[PDB]
Amino acid sequence: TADVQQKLAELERQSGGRLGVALINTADNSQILYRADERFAMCSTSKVMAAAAVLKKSESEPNLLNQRVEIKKSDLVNYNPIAEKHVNGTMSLAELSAAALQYSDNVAMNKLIAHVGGPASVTAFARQLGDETFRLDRTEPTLNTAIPGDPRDTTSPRAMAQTLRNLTLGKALGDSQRAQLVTWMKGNTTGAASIQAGLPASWVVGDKTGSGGYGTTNDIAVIWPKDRAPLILVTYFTQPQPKAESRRDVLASAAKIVTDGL
Numbered sequence: 001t002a003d004v005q006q007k008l009a010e011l012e013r014q015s016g017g018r019l020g021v022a023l024i025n026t027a028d029n030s031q032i033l034y035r036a037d038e039r040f041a042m043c044s045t046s047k048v049m050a051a052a053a054v055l056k057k058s059e060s061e062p063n064l065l066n067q068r069v070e071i072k073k074s075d076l077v078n079y080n081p082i083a084e085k086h087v088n089g090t091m092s093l094a095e096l097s098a099a100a101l102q103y104s105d106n107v108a109m110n111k112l113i114a115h116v117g118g119p120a121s122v123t124a125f126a127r128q129l130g131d132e133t134f135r136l137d138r139t140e141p142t143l144n145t146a147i148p149g150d151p152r153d154t155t156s157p158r159a160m161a162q163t164l165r166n167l168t169l170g171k172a173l174g175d176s177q178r179a180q181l182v183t184w185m186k187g188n189t190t191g192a193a194s195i196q197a198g199l200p201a202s203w204v205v206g207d208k209t210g211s212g213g214y215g216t217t218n219d220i221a222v223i224w225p226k227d228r229a230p231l232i233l234v235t236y237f238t239q240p241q242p243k244a245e246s247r248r249d250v251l252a253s254a255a256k257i258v259t260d261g262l
């Protein structure tokens with residue numbers, strides 16, 4: 001609709017920032033796109049690709065997910081809600097994946113990154129899936145600086161929506177691994193104020209949020225609307241001021257705009 005485009009442009013104008021949206025509606029294989037080829041700092045939405053890389057690795061390495069990883073004081077970073085409870089013990093790669101995806105734990109993300117060989121390995125995994133846009137450059141916490149004009153640790157809404165479709169609804173991962181990713185995302189604890197806040201209460205969502213510098217506020221989701229084919233929605237938002245506050249309401253508003261009528 002021209003109307004949906006006008007509404008997204010009006011939302012962006014009023015928000016004061018830069019908004020990126022990609023909706024894929026699998027009912028009819030249609031898309032709604034807004035700045036969908038521009039780059040945005042992913043922040044913690046990048047944790048989906050890191051967990052998926054570990055899941056892919058596990059397809060050839062049974063018991064990979066049970067492998068123990070030491071958590072040390074030296075591993076702590078700036079947001080460690082789960083890992084701080086396990087200092088001086090180990091967590092399994094499954095537990096680290098769940099902590100990264102469901103609590104957005106940054107130690108957990110760093111362990112996923114390290115396990116697969118670092119940010120360039122996460123990026124190479126994206127390339128193997130056919131995503132030639134995603135780039136993970138840094139580890140936690142520096143990957144969240146979100147400086148305007150900086151391509152590090154960015155992707156586009158179109159690419160992330162297409163890749164998330166592949167990961168959650170398509171065949172990027174084996175059936176067990178795909179189901180595990182979906183189960184983890186459906187159990188996310190951090191997304192109630194973002195895409196979920198713009199959808200009817202009855203709809204089921206698996207999502208991963210991200211927040212960072214420049215008031216960057218993001219969410220990527222697979223959505224099961226009541227009695228409808230699933231949707232994929234990416235909403236990325238960033239602001240001009242280094243210390244801008246988060247704007248999860250902008251993501252909720254974008255979600256409402258693009259799903260009105262469904």
Ligand SMILES: *[B@@-]1(O)O[C@H](CNS(=O)(=O)c2ccc([N+](=O)[O-])cc2)c2ccccc21
Pocket residue numbers: 043044045078079104105106141144189190191192209210211212
């Ligand atoms: B990354 O973007 O995710 C974590 C946590 N982000 S957060 O903004 O601190 C947050 C948002 C929402 C919730 N919630 O439960 O609703 C909890 C935390 C992170 C931290 C630091 C840097 C990057 C990321």
Ligand SMILES: [Cl-]
Pocket residue numbers: 199200201202
């Ligand atoms: Cl409702």
Ligand SMILES: [Cl-]
Pocket residue numbers: 044104190209210211
């Ligand atoms: Cl977040």
Ligand code: NA
Pocket residue numbers: 040041042043044143144145146152153154212
């Ligand atoms: Na980023």
Ligand code: NA
Pocket residue numbers: 131133134155156159160161163
């Ligand atoms: Na991407």
Ligand code: NA
Pocket residue numbers: 191192193194195196197205207219221
């Ligand atoms: Na959400």
